[PDB]
């Protein structure tokens, strides 16, 4: 009532594309507990790396690392299908407990991070400075990442839809599409958002028939 | 949201 224990900075994990995803937001009063269900990036992925971050920067690499830990034993499935619930829990004493739980396998891995770990009172103030100083640049990075994830979903999805369409797809369209996928896959390898959107444009246009067959 |  005269004071508050708060989180100076946001706390969370690194997610597909090097993005920091936030669990517990800046200036939250402890004790506190937030959960979020995540999934796997890649097909038949048997583990996930839980990389714990402190900071306000969109790029995981610009934020302060507090440790990382694996949850193994993820039973084979398509990417985006496993349920990994991730829980940040700050008790009344300032200690952070992060758990990942595979909601199919029941398996669990925790890490426990001292109240003292992470950025000192100064670093905190610098981090907020950089957040507002690099807002524009963080935004641009977010849009590239989101665009790369949009690109990759369109690629992964279209390849499946070609496998299940088999002989249904006119060889002609299958030629046009397999060329747009190879180019899309190359562009995804770069940092040019415009060029990824242009290969996504190329795929859309030549995939009208494939799309029909998926129904 | 997906982890690697």
UniProtKB/Swiss-Prot annotation, chain A:
The lineage of its organism: Bacteria, Pseudomonadati, Pseudomonadota, Gammaproteobacteria, Enterobacterales. Plays an essential role in the initiation of phage lambda DNA replication, where it acts in an ATP-dependent fashion with the DnaJ protein to release lambda O and P proteins from the preprimosomal complex. DnaK is also involved in chromosomal DNA replication, possibly through an analogous interaction with the DnaA protein. Also participates actively in the response to hyperosmotic shock. It is found in: Cytoplasm; Cell inner membrane. Autophosphorylated; GrpE inhibits the autophosphorylation. This is Chaperone protein DnaK. In pull-down experiments interacts with CedA. Transmembrane segments: none annotated. Belongs to the heat shock protein 70 family. Disruption phenotype: Non-essential; synthetic lethality is seen in a triple tig-dnaK-dnaJ disruption, although this depends on temperature (triple disruptions grow slowly at 20 and 34 degrees Celsius but not at all at 43 degrees) and strain background. The modification N6-succinyllysine is found at residues 114, 140, 199. The modification N6-acetyllysine is found at residues 33, 168. It comes from Escherichia coli (strain K12). Signal peptide: none annotated.
Curated annotation (Swiss-Prot), chain B:
It comes from the Bacteria. It is found in: Periplasm. Isozymes 1 and 3 are a dimer of identical chains, isozyme 2 is a dimer of heterogeneous chains, one of each of the subunits from isozymes 1 and 3. Belongs to the alkaline phosphatase family. This is Alkaline phosphatase. It comes from Escherichia coli (strain K12).
């Amino acid at each position: 009532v005269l004071l508050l224990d708060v989180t100076p900075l946001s706390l969370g994990i690194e997610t597909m594309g090097g993005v920091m995803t936030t669990l517990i937001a800046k200036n939250t009063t402890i004790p506190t507990k937030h959960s979020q269900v995540f999934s796997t990036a890649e097909d038949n992925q048997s583990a996930v790396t839980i990389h714990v971050l402190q900071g306000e920067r969109k790029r995981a690499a610009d934020n302060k690392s507090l440790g990382q830990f694996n949850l193994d034993g993820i039973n084979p499935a398509p990417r985006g299908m496993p349920q990994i619930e991730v829980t940040f829990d700050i008790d009344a004493d300032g200690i952070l407990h992060v758990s990942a739980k595979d909601k199919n396998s029941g398996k669990e891995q925790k890490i426990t991070i001292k109240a003292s770990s992470g950025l000192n009172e100064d670093e905190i103030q610098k981090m907020v400075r950089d957040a507002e100083a690099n807002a524009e640049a963080d935004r641009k990075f977010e849009e590239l990442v989101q665009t790369r994830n949009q690109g990759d979903h369109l690629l992964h999805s279209t390849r499946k839809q070609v496998e299940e369409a088999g002989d249904k797809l006119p060889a002609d369209d299958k030629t046009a599409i397999e060329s747009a996928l190879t180019a899309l896959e190359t562009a995804l390898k770069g940092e040019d958002k415009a060029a990824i959107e242009a290969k996504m444009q190329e795929l859309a246009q030549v995939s009208q028939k494939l799309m029909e067959i998926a129904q | 949201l997906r982890i690697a």
